[PDB]
Amino acid sequence: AMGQLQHGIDDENATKQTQKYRDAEQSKKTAYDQAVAAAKAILNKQDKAAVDRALQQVTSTKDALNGDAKLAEAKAAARQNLGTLNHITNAQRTALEGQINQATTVDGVNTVKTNANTLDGAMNSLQGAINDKDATLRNQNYLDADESKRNAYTQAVTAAEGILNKQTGGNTSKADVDNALNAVTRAKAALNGAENLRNAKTSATNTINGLPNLTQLQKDNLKHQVEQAQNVVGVNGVKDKGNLEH
Amino acid sequence: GQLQHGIDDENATKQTQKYRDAEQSKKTAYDQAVAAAKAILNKQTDKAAVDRALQQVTSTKDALNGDAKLAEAKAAARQNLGTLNHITNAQRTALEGQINQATTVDGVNTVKTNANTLDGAMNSLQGAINDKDATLRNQNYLDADESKRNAYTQAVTAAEGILNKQTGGNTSKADVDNALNAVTRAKAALNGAENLRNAKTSATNTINGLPNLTQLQKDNLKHQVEQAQNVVGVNGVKDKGN
Structure with missing residues (x-):
């Protein structure tokens, strides 16, 4: 699987540009990062079983990245909060609800949650x-x-x-x-x-x-x-x- | 004269942390108190209305609670700091110092964020x-x-x-x-x-x-x-x- 390991290393930068990685929990982001670093070193050395354990760890830590799960949670939190704003108009509410659904990052959602409270205020x-x-x-x-x-x-x-x-x-x-x-x-x-x-x-x-x-x-x-x-x-x-x- | 002073002192009030970190409602209540003060001044040719307006600019201003918000953020930050179990006593001590030196609510929260990521x-x-x-x-x-x-x-x-x-x-x-x-x-x-x-x-x-x-x-x-x-x-x- 020598190639698969190289693939894991090649996909690092790309994986790190994704929201799945970005908003993942620190520990999960670090574990993945450490797996890639480990892979590079192991790949350099070339215990074929060493290459697979390295591959397995890059694939595992990557799948573990939960930024996307964190985005769904954040959006859920925003929607919950949005429903407690008793002063915005329906038009304002649907726009906010829309911006929440359209948000691609946890920071974006919270920013939308922040503007919603300010507007309501x-x-x-x-x-x-x-x-x-x-x-x-x-x-x-x-x-x-x-x-x-x-x-x-x-x-x-x-x-x-x-x-x-x-x-x-x-x-x-x-x-x-x-x-x-x-x-x-x-x-x-x-x-x-x-x-x-x-x-x-x-x-x-x-x-x-x-x-x-x-x-x-x-x-x-x-x-x-x-x-x-x-x-x-x-x-x-x-x-x-x-x-x-x- | 006392009212114009309170008005020409609005900006020197909005620069302070007590205003900036105050609750939205507290801030607007103050801005509007000033807006009214100007208009109430413009309708003069009812000096009481000029006092009432004065009282409102002063009352709303003293109501600004950015200072309490800061103290609150600090307490929270310190409370959260005491729950971390992996930073060294040296780092913990340095973090505590940062919480004390902070001057704004966002500044305090940044320390809390850094403390947690460090512990991680x-x-x-x-x-x-x-x-x-x-x-x-x-x-x-x-x-x-x-x-x-x-x-x-x-x-x-x-x-x-x-x-x-x-x-x-x-x-x-x-x-x-x-x-x-x-x-x-x-x-x-x-x-x-x-x-x-x-x-x-x-x-x-x-x-x-x-x-x-x-x-x-x-x-x-x-x-x-x-x-x-x-x-x-x-x-x-x-x-x-x-």
């Missing part, structure tokens, strides 16, 4: 950023916010909801999810209804105080009405009432 | 000399060239010195492998078997030609030659030629 964040959507919309801070600001917020959440919908949401990327998240955060933190009301009450109060058609107590009444107003239009309604008073 | 190489090296006694008392070794026997004995002894948990030094993974390759190559190099066959053939030829015996008195000495079990044996029958 981001989706979770985007979901949290808009969990107070309805409440924010009914609040005076949103309602009396500059129209451009109110529109920016409604838009942000709209986009967010589209990305979030598990049934129709596409395979949005991590970068876009983050872009969507920032959109909601900054748009919401921009709502200035609270500030518009404070300024509204100030200008309305100062304007009333300076009106020529009002007695002082009439100004007090109106000023108090401004004080109790809960929103901008409420304030301006009082101011107008003051301008028509005679 | 060590175990493989041990397995390489398990058949030492058997080899030493075998004809393939005994009749092997002087230089080849030395190579195997040098490689084995060197390996045993590397393997002793109590006396072995802090041998690197690569050096463990070289030592391993030396034993394997040296043992496979033993040519006592070849020397014997070379001697039988050499003796047989000498036989076939020595002028003072008989096709009949030495067709059988050749037989004795072929039946010898070692080099001295072949040599033993040979002088039965002069």
Whole structure:
């Protein structure tokens, strides 16, 4: 079998380039490597039985390489983990599931498992950023916010909801999810209804105080009405009432 | 003013390990707190909202737990290190030092990975000399060239010195492998078997030609030659030629 042994030696580099070897357990990779080295030495010496024992060991350690078995295990682990991500959309899930099935190395799988958790984490964040959507919309801070600001917020959440919908949401990327998240955060933190009301009450109060058609107590009444107003239009309604008073 | 400080201090915060190794949620919570802070600042012409925003940048920042993550990785690494049984006390001590010096979570995990692969190489090296006694008392070794026997004995002894948990030094993974390759190559190099066959053939030829015996008195000495079990044996029958 002299030739078979030479074959085992020739196939070393090739075998070492394979995933079966690459991801095999260290000890198995080493045993194979040591068998090849042993074979070379034995082949050099030329106890024909020595050549066969050498061949047997190269063939045995090689078959023992279990990188492929380790790949199946890794993929199994990834699929198990993927199913625990409650925030990614179906489209995102199938893409990940696909990348898991398409992965050729243990490192690739884990990398896919890593991106899946990151993406889910981001989706979770985007979901949290808009969990107070309805409440924010009914609040005076949103309602009396500059129209451009109110529109920016409604838009942000709209986009967010589209990305979030598990049934129709596409395979949005991590970068876009983050872009969507920032959109909601900054748009919401921009709502200035609270500030518009404070300024509204100030200008309305100062304007009333300076009106020529009002007695002082009439100004007090109106000023108090401004004080109790809960929103901008409420304030301006009082101011107008003051301008028509005679 | 206090809020802009917390904002202009975001990057000097993202460089730190406490941020980089913090949980994803903790990191984003911080980034978004800053994003909001800027916007909340832009809507000013509600100073409380400026405090609330301040409180959030500070709260989220202090929440960053990259430092705890590191301490966790270290504990894990040390725990795993204590489960290895083949690295030498010297290597173990060196590994512990590496765990202490590490400054990032990935740095710690790399030490754990190296520790395990080292322990593996060590175990493989041990397995390489398990058949030492058997080899030493075998004809393939005994009749092997002087230089080849030395190579195997040098490689084995060197390996045993590397393997002793109590006396072995802090041998690197690569050096463990070289030592391993030396034993394997040296043992496979033993040519006592070849020397014997070379001697039988050499003796047989000498036989076939020595002028003072008989096709009949030495067709059988050749037989004795072929039946010898070692080099001295072949040599033993040979002088039965002069």
